[PDB]
Amino acid sequence: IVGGYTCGANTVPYQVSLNSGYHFCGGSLINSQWVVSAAHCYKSGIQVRLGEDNINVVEGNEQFISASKSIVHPSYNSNTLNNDIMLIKLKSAASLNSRVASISLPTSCASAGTQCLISGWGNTKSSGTSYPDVLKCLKAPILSDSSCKSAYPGQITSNMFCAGYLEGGKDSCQGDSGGPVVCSGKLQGIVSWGSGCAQKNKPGVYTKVCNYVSWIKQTIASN
Ligand SMILES: NC(=[NH2+])c1ccc2[nH]c(-c3ccccc3O)nc2c1
Ligand SMILES: [Ca+2]
Ligand SMILES: [Mg+2]
């Protein structure tokens, strides 16, 4: 996250870190047994780490649980990143408490202009590399589809939306993929892609979760 701030320990209690010997993507806890992340974060051998603040220090509020199964969206296209969403089931149910909580799925899609909270342990430099060990947060509004499509011609589908600032300076970045975009208390997006980080007229692109609620609900109930 570039141009964001330190969230605070366990202030984003639904945030998860996917680890395969190291942190490689974020995710969101939607209930005690399931996590939603981005399909491009798919790997075999994932351990989900809940209640994390610093990812390099065991501070006492963590739960490390291995995944029993991963389900990438049936229509995920790795070339365009259309339908960039996946579900991960935990081998054991997480214990929810103040530091580990689930986020609610939306009942409708949010409007352009709505402010959301984006979080993750990704790169914090637009031109450079600096990976933080504590969770970073960013409040950013959903942009109009017209500004999103003008920035990325022929690349935005109805399952994507842009959030951020066209001036640049603030954006999600590599290491943040699969993480949450929460607006009005609902999980409305998943960090998917962008062009570099925090560049002018190149906002971040997020998977539009409101279009997948029926698939998520149906899939977790059958697995
Ligand atoms: N600028 C952005 N809004 C952004 C967000 C997440 C990203 N994740 C990545 C990424 C790059 C290489 C491999 C995996 C990634 O998730 N680039 C990203 C760019
Ligand atoms: Ca830790
Ligand atoms: Mg994240």
Which domains can be identified in the chain, with CATH numbers?
1-12+103-210 (2.40.10.10), 13-102+211-223 (2.40.10.10)
Ligand that comes closest to the CA of residue 204 = 1
Q: If you count them, how many residues does the chain have?
A: 223
d(CA 34, CA 29): 6
Residue 177 assigned to a binding site: yes
- Is there a contact between 162 and 151 (Cβ–Cβ < 8 Å)? yes
Quote the distance between the C-alpha of residue 136 and its chain's center: 12
Rounded to whole angstroms, what are the CA distances from 149 to 115, 120, 157, 184?
A: 19, 25, 9, 24
Q: In the block, which residue shows the tokens 């993750």?
A: 120
| Residue ranges lining ligand 1, Cβ < 6 Å | 171-174, 176-177, 191, 193-194, 197, 204
Dihedral sign, Cα of residue 107, residue 112, residue 116, residue 122:
positive
Query: Catalytic annotation on 40?
Result: yes
Ligand that comes closest to the CA of residue 176 = 3
d(CA 192, CA 101): 23
d(CA 52, CA 61): 7
Q: In the block, which residue shows the tokens 């590599």?
A: 174
110, two tokens: 């949010």
Query: Catalytic annotation on 177?
Result: yes
d(CA 223, ligand 1 centre) in Å: 29
The angle subtended at Cα 197 by Cα 194 and Cα 200, nearest 5°, is 90
d(CA 102, CA 104): 7
**Pick from 175, 201, 156: nearest CA to 2:** 175
